[PDB]
């Protein structure tokens, strides 16, 4: 019973560490998404400020 113990918290320990290396992988893809947008939406705010300048 020990060892199979051993062997469970191994076979445990292996889905952890690859399910870990999935998550950070995950959140570096969704840490670049949420740059992109912010990105995206300062270059909206770029042509709001000149449009608003050359109408003034």
């Known amino acids: ?3 199979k113990l051993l ?13 870990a290396q999935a998550l950070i992988e995950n959140a570096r893809k969704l840490a670049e998404e949420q740059k992109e947008q912010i990105v995206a939406s300062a270059r909206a705010e770029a042509e709001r400020v000149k449009e608003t300048a050359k109408k003034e």
């Open 1 to 3: 019973e020990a060892e």
């Open 7 to 19: 062997e469970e918290q191994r076979e445990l320990m292996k889905q952890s560490r690859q399910e």
